[PDB]
């Protein structure tokens, strides 16, 4: 039995699998940090929970550091490949190729970055051996664990992109999806983490597998080669923080549009005092969806990767940017065309692009 | 994608989210080597020009938010989700609820959320009420005729006064939490 709820003197984990919760507990419980256990359950959910995350991506990695008592993110995003254009995505005619036909194409595919990103966690706070908190997933994929319910609904609803790959071999196996309590086994992704555990993340980022998937990435139609690989790196990112009911708030900067419009559409909304309306209440839906439109609008217009263009975050979270975009909002009618506001009433500089409007 | 999170004893404190993009990615699987490709790159702007076009090196916007909020200069309360544009939704809830409205934190985890970017795209969760369906399509929104979850939200809180952990995973997917009590 596991639980969605518990507690704890010495420390918690919390993951969207029970396995990768196991590893990531058991990790503290033999005196490792939350930065170990971090590295541990990463491994652990690329095994169990393989079509959400793992080495072949990217994320955002939040660490407060209970001795320095900094906060900073290790950002592995993936990065576009040299090759990449600005036009990679347009048809001859310049018009969108539909999102679903691009998903599948080598084009779609970034540097990824997953591993390193552990690798810096380690490096910075590790108190234990990636070769200690790869072993359990190792474990995972080479003998196999049986598929839950969200993986086996997976499987099932992706079942075409799947087939058209090596992918076939370990989740359509016979032609057949996995269903719901058979045992995954994922020995080819066994041996590359006990490549990564020999020989280090050079395992992925050089050498006879950076070829292969360098290789594979243009069979598919994608610009990738090993340079782009060898040239990786992830960036260290300085949080933005933000004041929300005494609350401070440290979250995400770009080249995630998450912090900045999580704190756009808390500064918002705290002018409406919403805790006034019943929390099932028509009101506060309306100033919650109210609050949205106007909110993703304004990240459409002005996010991005700040190594390349300039966010206005300044004006976008200025106290008078905020009275006005929530003085756009009225409960008894909805906006019918809201869009992007302008920040830059409320800062310095200018754009260094334009808004051209997404199909 | 998912989110997950951990805090020691020590007070280290981690929220992390990481994806491969879409569910399986592209599908791309590096042969012999059992490596699902990520298709994160369509992240980008498909028509160029604006500040999340395509360049070469540069990174895809992402919507993902791992968060901490501190008081006191403490950490006390970690939040993410996965969920691609919808997480800052998500994870905004989630803060509203706990907050705002003061809510214990699996009730606030579990409160039914909606989603909405632009005048022709909603999700709701159920629990939405019907009624409320009516009212807001009535006013010009809209909602659809079913409901869809939103997000997955694991979220640690920390008591700094007690000296203890609650971890919470959210019911839209099997995700389990584990406290640790050493001895």
Same mark, same amino acid.
């Given at each position: 039995?596991?639980?969605?709820?518990?507690?704890?003197?010495?420390?918690?984990?919390?993951?969207?699998?029970?396995?990768?919760?196991?590893?990531?507990? !058991?990790?503290?419980?033999?005196?490792?940090?939350?930065?170990?256990?971090?590295?541990?359950?990463?491994?652990?959910?690329?095994?169990?929970?393989?079509? /959400?995350?793992?080495?072949?991506?990217?994320?955002?990695?939040?660490?407060? @550091?209970?001795?320095?008592?900094?906060?900073?993110?290790?950002?592995?995003?993936?990065?576009?490949?040299?090759?990449?254009?600005?036009?990679?995505?347009?048809?001859?005619?310049?018009?969108?190729?539909?999102? &679903?036909?691009?998903?599948?194409?080598?084009?779609?595919?970034?540097?990824?970055?997953?591993?390193?990103?552990?690798?810096?966690?380690?490096?910075?706070?590790?108190?234990?051996?990636?070769?200690?908190?790869?072993?359990?997933?190792?474990?995972?994929?080479?003998?196999?664990? +049986?598929?839950? $319910?969200?993986?086996?609904?997976?499987?099932?609803?992706?079942?075409?992109?799947?087939?058209?790959?090596?992918?076939?071999?370990?989740?359509?196996?016979?032609?057949?999806?996995?269903?719901?309590? @058979?045992?995954?086994?994922?020995?080819?992704?066994?041996?590359?983490?006990?490549?990564?555990?020999?020989?280090?993340?050079?395992?992925?980022?050089?050498?006879?597998?950076?070829?292969?998937?360098?290789?594979?990435?243009?069979?598919?139609?994608?610009?990738?080669?090993?340079?782009?690989?060898?040239?990786?790196?992830?960036?260290? !990112?300085?949080?933005?923080?933000?004041?929300?009911?005494?609350?401070?708030?440290? %979250?995400?900067?770009?080249?995630?549009?998450?912090?900045?419009?999580?704190?756009?559409?808390?500064?918002?909304? @705290? =002018?409406?005092?919403? &805790?006034?309306?019943?929390?099932?209440?028509?009101?506060?839906?309306?100033?919650?969806?109210?609050? /949205?439109?106007?909110?993703?609008?304004?990240?459409?217009?002005?996010?991005?990767? +700040?190594?390349?263009?300039?966010?206005?975050?300044?004006?976008?979270?200025?106290?008078?940017?905020?009275?006005?975009?929530?003085?756009?909002?009225?409960?008894?009618?909805? #906006?019918?065309?809201?869009?992007?506001?302008?920040?830059?009433?409320?800062?310095?500089?200018?754009?260094?692009?334009?808004?051209?409007?997404?199909? | 994608?998912?989110?997950?999170? *951990?805090?020691?004893?020590?007070? #280290?404190?981690?929220?992390?989210?990481?994806?491969?993009?879409?569910?399986?990615?592209?599908?791309? /699987? *590096?042969?012999?080597?059992?490596?699902?490709?990520?298709?994160?790159? %369509?992240?980008?702007?498909?028509?160029?020009?604006?500040?999340?076009?395509?360049?070469? #090196?540069?990174?895809?916007?992402?919507?993902?938010? +791992?968060?901490?909020?501190?008081?006191?200069?403490? +950490?006390?309360?970690? *939040?993410?989700?996965?969920?691609?544009? %919808?997480?800052?939704?998500?994870?905004?809830?989630?803060?509203?609820? =706990?907050?705002?409205?003061?809510?214990?934190?699996?009730?606030?985890?579990?409160?039914?959320?909606?989603?909405?970017?632009?005048?022709? $795209?909603?999700?709701?969760?159920?629990?939405?009420?019907?009624?409320?369906?009516?009212?807001?399509?009535?006013?010009?929104?809209?909602?659809?005729?079913?409901?869809?979850?939103?997000?997955?939200?694991?979220?640690?809180?920390?008591? =700094?006064?007690?000296?203890?952990?609650?971890?919470?995973?959210?019911?839209?997917?099997?995700?389990?939490?584990?406290?640790? #009590?050493?001895?």
């Amino acid at each position: 039995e596991y639980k969605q709820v518990d507690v704890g003197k010495d420390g918690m984990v919390a993951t969207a699998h029970p396995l990768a919760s196991e590893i990531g507990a !058991d990790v503290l419980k033999k005196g490792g940090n939350a930065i170990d256990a971090a590295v541990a359950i990463q491994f652990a959910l690329n095994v169990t929970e393989p079509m /959400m995350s793992g080495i072949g991506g990217g994320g955002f990695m939040m660490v407060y @550091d209970g001795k320095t008592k900094d906060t900073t993110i290790i950002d592995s995003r993936e990065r576009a490949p040299a090759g990449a254009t600005p036009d990679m995505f347009l048809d001859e005619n310049g018009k969108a190729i539909p999102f &679903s036909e691009r998903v599948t194409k080598g084009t779609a595919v970034g540097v990824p970055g997953t591993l390193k990103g552990l690798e810096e966690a380690l490096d910075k706070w590790g108190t234990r051996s990636m070769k200690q908190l790869i072993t359990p997933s190792i474990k995972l994929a080479e003998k196999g664990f +049986p598929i839950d $319910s969200v993986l086996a609904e997976a499987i099932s609803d992706y079942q075409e992109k799947l087939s058209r790959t090596a992918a076939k071999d370990v989740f359509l196996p016979n032609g057949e999806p996995l269903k719901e309590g @058979d045992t995954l086994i994922q020995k080819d992704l066994a041996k590359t983490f006990k490549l990564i555990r020999s020989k280090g993340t050079d395992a992925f980022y050089k050498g006879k597998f950076a070829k292969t998937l360098s290789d594979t990435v243009q069979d598919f139609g994608g610009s990738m080669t090993e340079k782009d690989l060898e040239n990786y790196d992830i960036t260290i !990112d300085e949080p933005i923080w933000g004041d929300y009911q005494g609350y401070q708030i440290a %979250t995400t900067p770009p080249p995630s549009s998450g912090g900045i419009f999580l704190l756009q559409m808390l500064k918002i909304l @705290d =002018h409406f005092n919403l &805790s006034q309306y019943d929390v099932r209440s028509w009101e506060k839906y309306q100033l919650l969806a109210e609050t /949205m439109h106007l909110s993703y609008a304004d990240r459409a217009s002005y996010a991005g990767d +700040p190594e390349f263009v300039n966010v206005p975050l300044k004006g976008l979270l200025h106290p008078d940017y905020i009275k006005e975009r929530q003085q756009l909002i009225n409960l008894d009618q909805v #906006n019918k065309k809201p869009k992007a506001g302008d920040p830059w009433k409320y800062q310095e500089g200018s754009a260094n692009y334009k808004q051209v409007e997404q199909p | 994608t998912t989110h997950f999170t *951990v805090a020691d004893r020590w007070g #280290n404190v981690v929220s992390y989210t990481t994806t491969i993009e879409q569910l399986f990615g592209t599908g791309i /699987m *590096v042969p012999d080597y059992g490596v699902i490709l990520n298709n994160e790159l %369509t992240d980008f702007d498909a028509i160029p020009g604006g500040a999340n076009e395509v360049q070469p #090196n540069k990174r895809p916007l992402s919507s993902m938010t +791992p968060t901490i909020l501190f008081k006191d200069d403490k +950490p006390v309360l970690t *939040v993410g989700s996965p969920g691609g544009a %919808t997480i800052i939704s998500s994870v905004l809830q989630t803060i509203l609820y =706990h907050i705002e409205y003061g809510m214990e934190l699996k009730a606030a985890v579990e409160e039914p959320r909606i989603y909405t970017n632009s005048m022709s $795209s909603y999700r709701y969760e159920d629990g939405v009420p019907k009624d409320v369906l009516s009212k807001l399509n009535g006013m010009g929104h809209k909602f659809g005729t079913s409901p869809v979850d939103i997000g997955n939200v694991q979220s640690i809180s920390i008591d =700094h006064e007690n000296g203890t952990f609650k971890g919470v995973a959210d019911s839209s997917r099997n995700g389990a939490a584990i406290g640790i #009590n050493l001895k």
